[PDB]
Amino acid sequence: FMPVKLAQALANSLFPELDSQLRAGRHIGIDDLDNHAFLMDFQEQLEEFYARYNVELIRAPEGFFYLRPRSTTLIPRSVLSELDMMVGKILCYLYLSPERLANQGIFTSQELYEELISLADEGKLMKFVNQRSSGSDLDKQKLQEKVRTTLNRLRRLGMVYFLPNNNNKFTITEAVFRFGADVRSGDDPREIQLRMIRDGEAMPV
Amino acid sequence: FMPVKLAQALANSLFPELDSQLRAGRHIGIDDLDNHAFLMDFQEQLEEFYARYNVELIRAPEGFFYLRPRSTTLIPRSVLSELDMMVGKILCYLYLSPERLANQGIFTSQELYEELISLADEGKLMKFVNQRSSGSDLDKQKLQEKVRTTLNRLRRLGMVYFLPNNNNKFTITEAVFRFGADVRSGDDPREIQLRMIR
Amino acid sequence: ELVSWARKNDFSISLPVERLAFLMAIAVLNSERLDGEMSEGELIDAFREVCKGFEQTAESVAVRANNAINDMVRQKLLNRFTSELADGNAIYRLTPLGISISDYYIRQREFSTLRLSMQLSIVANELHRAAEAAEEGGDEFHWHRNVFAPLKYSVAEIFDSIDMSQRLMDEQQNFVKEDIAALLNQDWQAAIANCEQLLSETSGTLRELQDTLEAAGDKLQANLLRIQDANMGSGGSELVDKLVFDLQSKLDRIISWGQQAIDLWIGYDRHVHKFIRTAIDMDKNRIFSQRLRQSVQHYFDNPWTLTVANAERLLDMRDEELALRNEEVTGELPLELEYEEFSEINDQLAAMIEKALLVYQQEQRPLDLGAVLRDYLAQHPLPRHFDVARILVDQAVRLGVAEADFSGLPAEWLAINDYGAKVQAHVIDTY
Amino acid sequence: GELIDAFREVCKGFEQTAESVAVRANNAINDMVRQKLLNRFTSELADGNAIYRLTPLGISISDYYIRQREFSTLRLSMQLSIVANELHRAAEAAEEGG
Amino acid sequence: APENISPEKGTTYKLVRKVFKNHEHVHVVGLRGFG
Amino acid sequence: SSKSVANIIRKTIQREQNRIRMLNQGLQAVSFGQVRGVRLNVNVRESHAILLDVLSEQQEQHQDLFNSQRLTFSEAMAKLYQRLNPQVDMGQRLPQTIGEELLDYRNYLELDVEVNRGSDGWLKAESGALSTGEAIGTGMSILVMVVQSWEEESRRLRGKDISPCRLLFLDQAARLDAKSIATLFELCERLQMQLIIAAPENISPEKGTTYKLVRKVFKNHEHVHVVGLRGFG
Amino acid sequence: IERGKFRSLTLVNWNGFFARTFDLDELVTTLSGGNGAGKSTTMAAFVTALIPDLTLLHFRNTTEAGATSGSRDKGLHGKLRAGVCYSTLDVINSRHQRVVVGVRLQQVAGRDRKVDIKPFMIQGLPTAIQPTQLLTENVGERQARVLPLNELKDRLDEMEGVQFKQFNSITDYHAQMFDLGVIPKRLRSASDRSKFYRLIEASLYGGISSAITRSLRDYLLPENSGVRKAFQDMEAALRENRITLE
């Protein structure tokens, strides 16, 4: 009925955490460990197993895995927001950046917001939190709170984990590299985006 | 290793869609002939398979199968909102005995809307839309939009089956009894369901 | 309490690049100085040289040098001494703060564990000598000159020097961390071997330091316990206890850090370890880094958001939220609290009876329970009589005991009232 | 977790509130660490998930004032005795000429 | 009982341990006829 | 790994021994009955010292027990503890549980109290030899030493303007003797310590406030009548 | 310096206690009564108010311990009556500030014996206002009612100056209490709370009786995870050895 290795993987004690949290939109990385430490062992088996539900466990050249539902996906589809991709790219830069290695992977929402506002444009960014904003500090605080909420939602979807005693400090998954899907290759970001939407990996909101 | 019959069940061509809907939260009543029969045959293994997710595959006394999440559910839970809970009780109250005299199993959004407005207290209706509102037409429109949203949300869970058109008329499945109180011999369904709605 | 102490003290230490440079320069000159004394005529030239090698001219050399020297003096970095004969008519010297800043970088950061070994040897010798002298237990003055003055300051200084070595190891492990970080920035892939070698050698250094620490801690702890035992050789040795107290924790603390650092380091290593297989093996050529940065700078022109199966995680019936037991309870609110003199319903009469029997005790008067009970019970009604009798007996018997009890002759059941009540009691005679 | 409380106490006894306690404490600790006054060590189990220690520079600044400053000349006397002993021993060993 | 129950009815014996001339002893006063 | 486990356990035990002998100091001469002083004794238990030695230096020599598929790691530990030091031999409480207990370093230490009882010197404060009030005073002394340490530690963080509230409890105060109760009261007030004490009989009539409680059945439920009391009879 | 002082304890709708208030002495307060007088219930109610962490609370009495004292529910649910109930303590700060800390307890529904606990605190309450009166409304002749949290908030907000606060977490409850000099130690961590509860529960029992001697190790010696990690490393090595052997 099944290949030996696929049944082996499905029999692993970690397998239910993996399957369930991937169905719940969580994604695979250094954090989100229970869904990664053995999925490295059966990537092909889990991918062919998931194809039955018209969904694909996709690995980029990066070591992270994440779930993508087809158009005919049996498990229904949904998407994230622009600010989510933003915080995600900042988190990916943090993950790669060896300069902050001394942080040992632990990072604080203030560091995240500082890096985000440093790399990005404050006002053009803030246009999306609220359409009418014109540099009001109330909208800046709104953006900071929205960054906090997006970090929470990314925690729900396997990009970050709050420390047991600290919701202000967090550790990052390698699923963060999902956000670098338009930069994982030297091809154009737009043509790669077309290939993602073709492979249903990303869509504009 | 893995139980051989569990391998047979999971390899079953009907396993994918059934599993996906179960992850969604959709119940599987007797109306789903193929899913129901497959569940009846392979429950002994599928219960273990889902309990590995710390989720119980419960067959109700009504016979419909559904995934009860434990507190430790490995599939992070979403829940039916407050308006979803009361609209679900109103749906069961639209599926109980008295509806046979009024809608013969085929209901419309107007029936549910009228029952919700007449039966539910104005206080909880305002809690649904807003505490400051008072009977205004716009607030009623917002409440109706939320009613449609929760109706579709119940549709995703296989608790209401839509008639195939954009018009919001539908039938209600037996699984709706998860909302209502358990029926006892000699109990008036109206009395118990109203006491719970009250 | 120390908060206001500091607040009203009002102090500050700070150092721009030029000022800190001038500080090392003065320190080096002093290390070269004939008599260690620094005349302002040399300070001005040193400031001129450092600014020259820094190439800034805001104003005259004189004014800037004056401002700088005044700043360090006020910042408790220099001590000034007027002397008309001196060149420039003044002399200057390093303050201890300036000394501790200059040496922190210049004096060799001697991470060499042999410094730790010789320090441990010195500590063992001095500690044994002090414990020996405490065991000798001379007079109070001998106790002091052997166990506070030599012990306190010597052990404090060498514990602080050992901690200084620990802090130098701390700064060095920090340094290797920043150096690994920087090397990864410059070599990227090519830094892997260098980083791994640095981690290995740091681990070895930490292991040898831990071994050097544990090599003497246990015996030093035994020495401290010996000193504690000897400390009871003089009542006024309480202050010694405080040292005998304190020095233990310090020692333990040292040992604690000796392990703790490795516990941290070995963890940090693994992070570095994971990093190499979670950052560079996937970005071997680093191109992903610059491309990600550019995409961040220009994201909105590639508007895309990731697609997942996140439509519903697991929809379910909502809880019976906050449905609790309740009855809108009511109850008879307590009235004004009544008072009774410790069960006065019995204890007024307990005081009365204990007095009326304390008389028998005071005169050692023979107590016949039958007669006393009979005389007494008449004052109270029959339903209370039993309650009375117990209270009387619990008093009467405590007073002495009956001597006839040991004659072997049982006492009789003397009646003490009507209705048939009886008491078996020998006459209490021996109080 | 103790550094934050200490900063709160010192600012309290200084009575200044520019911003939240958290932000000011964060800025201050970062300033001393970067100023080579504190050494930071990440540790998930630790309270606040981090530990801190005095650097030798901070040690030499704190002790410059708060050490007894032992002006007691007996410290000088014992130091002179130690110097005489060690110097004689080293001169003796040099005369041994191994 | 340890006297925290000692009701009216029956032969009530009051056992009280004491040392009499170094002899361990328990004096016993009797009561009856009550109730 | 076995050697490392033994070494870390021994280091932890020694550190704790130092800390407890450290905390022992700073005790005033309490006058609970004949007990004129209190102290804490910490030592390694021989039954577990032998086991530690076997683990550190003789792990391999009983690897047969450890590789026994029938034995879990805790069961393996329990069985080894049965093999050496067979005077502790016990199997009615399951070997798994005894091994799990053995997985606690703190159990390995004997941790007892010595009391300066009269002029007899420091004697182990065994409950079968000390008057029960003396034992209660000893326990209170231990508790107050702990809370003294707690307060002293937080002395820096707290401003001196506030002296933290102090309040402990003592049920079944009837155990104590008048001497022990008076010593407790004097110690507590010297330490500005508040106390809540309970006894069947009012053993503290002349000190503090006093309440008496009586429970009555009433229409199928229960009520507690509280009555005040006053310092005489 | 004038150490702060606990003034009184109010037990509302407790098992056997409807609106009882005991005025605590400055130094020594004593409770008396024969079998089953409920003194342990009063001590338990106080300590529950002090440390509302439901997990730590497990009240086997000093004597006649265990469930038969009414503690198969951990001595909380069944030691309460059904419905709204209160446990509140007035404290005069060393700064001479009156503060009434308190906890609203409620029996949880179903066969289970869990208790819903909500901490709260009040400052600026007039010294005259007795908590018994504050926490009760006189409905019916001489048999007053007890009012829930929302009614208490309404009543207190209607009073000038008084400020009523509810803590979403026990941690902030204890932080505020400490800031008011109510706690000697900053129980920033649940472990600090655990050791605190150890000390109070041992004092409750009192002396070196069997439980106190047994748990003296826990009371004095902190837990060390180093031993646990070392043991687990040994376990993993043993497992892998067995695997290789087979």
Author numbering:
A (entry chain E1): 9 to 213
B (entry chain F1): 9 to 206
C (entry chain C1): 10 to 440
D (entry chain D1): 50 to 147
E (entry chain A1): 1434 to 1468
F (entry chain B1): 1236 to 1468
G (entry chain B1): 2 to 247
List sentences quoted exactly from the publication behind this structure.
Although the map was resolved to only 6.8 Å, which prevented determination of the nucleotide state, it was very similar to exploratory reconstructions of nucleotide-free MukBEF. Hence, we refer to it as the “apo state. The two MukBEF monomers associate head to head with their MukEF subunits on the same face of the dimer.
MukBEF activity within the replication terminus macrodomain is suppressed by the sequence-specific unloader MatP. MukBEF is the SMC complex of E. coli and other enterobacteria. Its SMC subunit is MukB, which associates with the kleisin MukF (Woo et al., 2009; Zawadzka et al., 2018).
